[PDB]
Design a binder for this molecule. Sequence first.
Ligand code: VWW
Ligand code: VWW
Lengths: 208, 208
Amino acid sequence: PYTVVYFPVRGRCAALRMLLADQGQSWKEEVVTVETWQEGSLKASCLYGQLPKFQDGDLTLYQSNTILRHLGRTLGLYGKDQQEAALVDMVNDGVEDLRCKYISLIYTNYEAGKDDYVKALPGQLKPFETLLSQNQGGKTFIVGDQISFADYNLLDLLLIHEVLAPGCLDAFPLLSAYVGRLSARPKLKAFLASPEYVNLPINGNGKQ
Amino acid sequence: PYTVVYFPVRGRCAALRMLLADQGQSWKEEVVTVETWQEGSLKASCLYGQLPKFQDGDLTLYQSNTILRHLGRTLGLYGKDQQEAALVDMVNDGVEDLRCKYISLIYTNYEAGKDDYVKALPGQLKPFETLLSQNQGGKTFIVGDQISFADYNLLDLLLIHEVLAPGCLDAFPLLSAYVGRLSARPKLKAFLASPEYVNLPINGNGKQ
Ligand SMILES: N[C@@H](CCC(=O)N[C@@H](CSCc1ccccc1)C(=O)N[C@@H](C(=O)O)c1ccccc1)C(=O)O
Ligand SMILES: N[C@@H](CCC(=O)N[C@@H](CSCc1ccccc1)C(=O)N[C@@H](C(=O)O)c1ccccc1)C(=O)O
C-alpha cells in the first residue's frame, strides 16, 4: 500500500495526508526523528538527501509535489481532461511558490520578517480568490466541479496562514467559504480533529 | 497555435523553447520589454503578476513548469505510463529546486556567493548522475527510453551551469555524455545555434 517516511511534523506531508484520509486510503507512517536523521545513513540513501520519501508498492518517490501529482493521477484527482489538468498544475505551482515564501519566513527570519510578510499577504492570496470567482462563482472546487490534489494543497496553505495571521481570510469571502466547505467533508473533518493531525507541530522549529 | 509572452531573455522559457523546437512545433514570441512591464497594465492582468504567459489556442497558462507539463501531456513527453510519469515529475522537481538556488545566486548575491555555490555544485549534480546510472546505464534519457519534458529542463539547467562554472560536468561522465547526446539531436542542434537562442542573454541582469 502506501508508506510516508517523514519527520514528526505536518510540514510538506499535511496536504498528501489530508488527500489520503479524505479519499478513504490507508497508509503507514514511518517516523524519522532528528536524531536518526543526523546519524547520516538514511539521508545518504535519499535521492536529493531530503524527506518526505513515499512508497506505493515498490515504487519509491521523493518530492512532496511529485507525490501529490502521483496520487492525483492514480486516484483520479487531476481534472476531467487535459485543459483542467493544466489548470490544476497552475494552481499547485502557485501554492508551491507561496509555500516557499512561508517556509523561508519560518526558518530564516520569523521574528524580523513576520510583519512585512503579513502586510504582503493580501496580494499573495488574491490570485486564488480570483480563480475561485471564475469557477462557478466559487461554489465548488478550485478547478472544475470535482476535487483535485491542488485543493488539498491549497487548503493546507490557507489553514497554516490562518494560524500565522489570524483573520487574514476575512477580506476574501470565497476563500473563507471554500475553507469552511472543504473542512466540512466527512472523512477530512474527522482527520483534522484527530490526535494524528492535531498533536503534530506545523513546522520543525516550533514556529507557526 | 502557441504564443509565449516573456522578457527578451532565455530564463524560464529556454527549456520550453527547446522542447517546441525539437518537437518541430511553431510558436509566436511576444516580447515584453522592461519598459512595457513597468507601465503596469500587463503585470496587473497576469494571474500571479509574473511572466512567462503562454497560450495554446484560447487556453492561457502561467508558471513555466505548468507550461512544461502541459506540453509534455499534449505532445506525449510524459513517460510511457504512470510510474514513469511519477519519475519524470521527481526529476523535474529536482531540477526546479536547483534552478531556484541558481536564480537566487544570480539575482541576490552573485559576487559574494559565487564561490560557495560552485563548491557545493557537485553534491547538487550527483542525484542526476545517479538517476542516469540507474536507467540503462545512462545510454538513453533521464527517465525511460523516450524523451520527456524533464529532459529539456535538465538539459537547460546543465547548460547554464557549464556557463557559470566551466567544466563542472567533468566529474560526471554520464551527465557529460547525456548533454552531448541531446545537444546533437537535429532540430535541437539547429535551434541552439540560431540567433533566436544565441543572441538572448541567459538572465535579466546580464550575469551568468
Ligand atoms: N522540494 C522538496 C523539499 C523537501 C524538504 O525541504 N525536506 C526537508 C524537510 S521539510 C522541512 C522540515 C525541516 C526540519 C524538520 C522538519 C521539517 C528536509 O529533508 N530537511 C533536512 C535536510 O535537508 O537534510 C533537515 C535539515 C535540518 C534538520 C532536519 C532535517 C519537497 O517538496 O519534498
Ligand atoms: N514560478 C514562476 C516564476 C516566474 C518569474 O519568476 N517571473 C519573473 C521573470 S523570470 C526572471 C527574470 C527577471 C527579470 C527579467 C527577466 C527575467 C517575473 O515576472 N519578474 C518580474 C516581476 O516579478 O514583476 C520582474 C521583476 C523585475 C524586473 C522585471 C520583471 C514560473 O516558474 O513561471
